[PDB]
Structure 1
Amino acid sequence: VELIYKVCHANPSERARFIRCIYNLLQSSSPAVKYEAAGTLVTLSSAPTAIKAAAQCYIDLIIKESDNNVKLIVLDRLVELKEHPAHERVLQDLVMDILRVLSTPDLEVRKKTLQLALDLV
């Protein structure tokens, strides 16, 4: 017997069902910002660069939902980390620069990152 009216009431078991129940009550344009899904998810690619590369992808997606032309593919939500105020301190673009890569982190993360610079902006 699953689905609660509450937030919880306690314990890992209730907690595990709860992220399933949350995805129901907001399906809309992926989870966007991953819920209690995040904990199992890292181990799913323990070998080792692939986690960061994946993580980088989600973080880029999350920033904004742009036009979505050829390699401008960022989904998730339109505003939830914006892009580009001129009063924002120390700005969004600092994280965007990582994604522009020569190899600036390692090659698996690099391939993901170049696509990801292209994708947000």
Structure 2
Amino acid sequence: VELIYKVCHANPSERARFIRCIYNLLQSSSPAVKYEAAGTLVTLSSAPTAIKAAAQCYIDLIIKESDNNVKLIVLDRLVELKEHPAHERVLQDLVMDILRVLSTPDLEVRKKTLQLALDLV
């Protein structure tokens, strides 16, 4: 017997069902910002660069939902980390620069990152 009216009431078991129940009550344009899904998810690619590369992808997606032309593919939500105020301190673009890569982190993360610079902006 699953689905609660509450937030919880306690314990890992209730907690595990709860992220399933949350995805129901907001399906809309992926989870966007991953819920209690995040904990199992890292181990799913323990070998080792692939986790960061994946993580980088989600973080880029999350920033904004742009036009979505050829390699401008960022989904998730339109505003939730914006892009580009001129009063924002120390700005969004600092994280965007990582994604522009020569190899600036390692090659698996690099391939993901170049696509990801292209994708947000």
TM-score by length of 1: 1.00
- Return the alpha-carbon distance in structure 1 between the equivalents of residues 33 and 80 of structure 2: 9
Residue 82 (structure 1) aligns with: 82
Considering only aligned residues, what root-mean-square deviation do their CA atoms show, in Å? 0.0
- Return the alpha-carbon distance in structure 2 between the equivalents of residues 52 and 13 of structure 1: 28
- Return the alpha-carbon distance in structure 2 between the equivalents of residues 42 and 117 of structure 1: 23
- Return the alpha-carbon distance in structure 2 between the equivalents of residues 49 and 70 of structure 1: 26
Give 5+ residue unaligned stretches, structure 2: none
- Return the alpha-carbon distance in structure 1 between the equivalents of residues 96 and 89 of structure 2: 14
Q: Structure 1 stretches (4+) deviating beyond 2 angstroms?
A: none
Give 5+ residue unaligned stretches, structure 1: none
Deviation at residue 96 of structure 1 after TM alignment: 0.0
Secondary structure in 2 matching 1:40? helix
Deviation at residue 78 of structure 1 after TM alignment: 0.0
Q: Percent identity?
A: 100
- Return the alpha-carbon distance in structure 1 between the equivalents of residues 16 and 81 of structure 2: 27
Deviation at residue 114 of structure 1 after TM alignment: 0.0
Secondary structure in 1 matching 2:17? helix
TM-score by length of 2: 1.00
Deviation at residue 8 of structure 1 after TM alignment: 0.0
Deviation at residue 89 of structure 1 after TM alignment: 0.0
- Return the alpha-carbon distance in structure 1 between the equivalents of residues 66 and 33 of structure 2: 17
